[PDB]
């Protein structure tokens, strides 16, 4: 219905009850509320949508509700320059279908936790062969360790077909609540901690940067592929009385608390250098005893396992 065929810039709050097809570039400025209630189609790859929150205002909402559908082969940027402990934002991407073969970038200046913000990616169906980014354009410090403003991906019982890349590079923490699938996908934890509380975790590789962490709140039956493991990061597993073992032939790290967690970290690690310790983590406002594994060594030069 609404077709953007020439570079367009719109001002103020926007509520799209029509299907929106963008083949050029659409820019949304000076609005505290951007709503796409039906189709939002961005194609071909050179097309783009950029939603800029109104500056120096209290609340910001970007919404793709369950009535909507997202089909992006170009570039969708959601940017909010508002920052500070009183910031309230609601970036709620919950379309019936979320199909991305291009780039989606969440670019926020308010990345600290708070009491009231929501950052949600939880459609019914999730399809990503491109790149989804969460980046910071702020400089906030002194996080209050609250439960709001934590990017939460998926939900219990729904799946996420991640054939491409999810880049997490903005905040102290992120939550993965849905079931990831597809063998080619990667989740890159470039800053902060990733907490996983999901029914299963299939196919993807979790790549940890330095001074990041992966924490599984509940064990999954799948072996979880994690790469980048070295003295700069850790894998945490919820539960008390933690023990662990590393198999040099398969490259699999097995952690046992009250449940069994299995991580494929690669071959080449020396198990005699590894150690573990009990700590306490916070997840969705509750404290959990957690067993941490520190490999205490660099990434091996060759991660391949013997046949």
Numbering used by the authors: 18 to 324
Task: Copy text verbatim from the article accompanying this structure deposition.
Though it lacks typical virulence factors such as hyphal development, C. glabrata contains a remarkably large and diverse set of putative wall adhesins that is crucial for its success as pathogen. C. glabrata wall adhesins are large, modular glycosylphosphatidylinositol (GPI)-modified proteins. The N-terminal region of mature GPI cell wall proteins (GPI-CWPs)–also referred to as A-region–is believed to define the ligand-binding function. The A-regions of Awp1 and Awp3b consist of 34 and 33 β-strands, respectively, which form a two-domain architecture with a parallel right-handed β-helix at its N-terminus (Awp1: S18-V240 with strands β0-β26, Awp3b: D20-I254 with β1-β26) that is followed by a β-sandwich domain with α-crystallin fold (Awp1: V241-Q314, Awp3b: V255-E334; both with strands β27- β33).
The Awp1-A crystals belong to space group P43212 with two molecules per asymmetric unit and diffracted to a resolution of 1.85 Å. The Awp1-A structure was solved by MR using the Awp3b-A structure as template, followed by 20 cycles of model building in ARP/wARP. Structural similarity between the A-regions of Awp1 and Awp3b is evident from a calculated root mean square deviation (RMSD) of 1.36 Å for 223 Cα positions. Additionally, Awp1-A has a truncated turn comprising only PB3-T3 at the N-terminus (β0: S18-P24). Another feature of striking regularity can be observed along the PB1 sheet of the Awp1-A β-helix. Here, a Ser/Thr ladder stretches over 8 β-turns along the exterior face at the beginning of each β-strand (S42, S65, T92, T120, T148, T182, S203, and T222). In a +2 position, a second outer stack consisting of four Thr and four Asn, interrupted by an isoleucine residue, stretches along the whole PB1 sheet. The four asparagine side chains (χ1 ~-63°, χ2 ~-53°) resemble the interior Asn stack by forming a hydrogen bonding network between the side chains’ carboxamide groups. The A-regions of the Awp1 and Awp3 subclusters are almost all predicted to be heavily O-glycosylated at the α-crystallin domain and the following cysteine-comprising stretch (Awp1: 8 sites; Awp3b: 16 Sites), but not along the β-helix domain. Furthermore, there is no Ca2+ binding site predicted for Awp1-A because none of the lanthanides from the crystallization condition was observed in the Awp1 A-region structure.
